[PDB]
Design an enzyme around this catalytic site. Structure first.
Site, PDB file in Angstrom:
ATOM      1  N   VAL A  11       3.710   5.746  -5.102  1.00  0.00           N
ATOM      2  CA  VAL A  11       2.926   4.837  -5.333  1.00  0.00           C
ATOM      3  C   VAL A  11       3.401   4.041  -6.714  1.00  0.00           C
ATOM      4  CG1 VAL A  11       0.625   4.087  -5.682  1.00  0.00           C
ATOM      5  CG2 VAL A  11       1.114   5.907  -4.142  1.00  0.00           C
ATOM      6  N   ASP A  12       4.157   2.733  -6.526  1.00  0.00           N
ATOM      7  CA  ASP A  12       4.520   2.076  -7.571  1.00  0.00           C
ATOM      8  C   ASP A  12       3.953   0.537  -7.856  1.00  0.00           C
ATOM      9  OD1 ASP A  12       6.185   1.379  -9.631  1.00  0.00           O
ATOM     10  OD2 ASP A  12       7.967   1.834  -8.415  1.00  0.00           O
TER      11      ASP A  12
END
EC number: 3.4.23.-
Lengths: 138, 123
Positions: free
Chosen positions: A32-33
């Site tokens: 999750v970026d």
């Protein structure tokens, strides 16, 4: 000693943010970026999951900072299972060891809340826990 | 027998307004980075260059106050020569029990709430 002084300190593990997802019934750990302009799927995973037919090779370019950066194509829509919900996502496909990287585009599309207090990601109508350091791919 | 060209919508990155020693800064909110970073340039301008711990990247600032809305939030920074003046990473988001709320378009950090910046305002 005659007196005991208490100087507290916090110790906080800072693992990368990952969640469990499923793509065509294949379990995947997804990065999750919020610093990514696009959402990525590896060529390896696209092929394994039977999504290669939907790799649209008209859409290429560069995703600098992942693999060699050389885009192979775009999957315009593939359903991603997160807990009990399938949600539609788009993917930039390239050769990388990162199976799925969920970028800011998909996080915004699905009105996500990245909750570091509760250690969960709320996306669409579901909630899923961030992985512990032990479950995170390296 | 083919051509390549740029197409005729880019997602804006997450930024917030913060103040370091009264200097307004636009900070990049990046869950993809483990470590919060401050540019050498901003450390100079805000008067924090004398707080850079150099024992083994220029060094580390251990506690510096970041003003967000009306409150000060103590943060640690790894100092690099970079175009990005402040990058808020996972370390500080976790330390300050933050929520990156894309439904309301706000960052909740420590006891405050601040809006993400418009695309036109991003550095």
């Amino acid at each position: 000693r005659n007196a005991i002084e208490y100087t507290p300190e916090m110790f906080t593990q800072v693992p990368m943010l990952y969640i469990n997802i499923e793509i065509n019934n294949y379990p995947v750990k997804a990065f999750v970026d919020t610093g990514a302009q696009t959402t990525i799927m590896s060529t390896r995973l696209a092929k394994k999951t039977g999504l290669s037919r939907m790799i649209d090779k008209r859409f290429i370019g560069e995703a600098r900072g992942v693999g060699t950066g050389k885009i192979i194509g775009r999957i315009h829509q593939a359903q991603v299972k997160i807990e009990t919900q399938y949600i539609p996502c788009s993917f930039t496909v390239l050769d990388t060891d990162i199976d799925v990287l969920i970028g800011l585009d998909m996080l915004k599309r699905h009105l996500a809340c990245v909750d570091l207090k509760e250690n969960v990601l709320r996306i669409a109508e579901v909630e899923t826990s961030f992985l512990s350091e032990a479950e995170i791919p390296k």
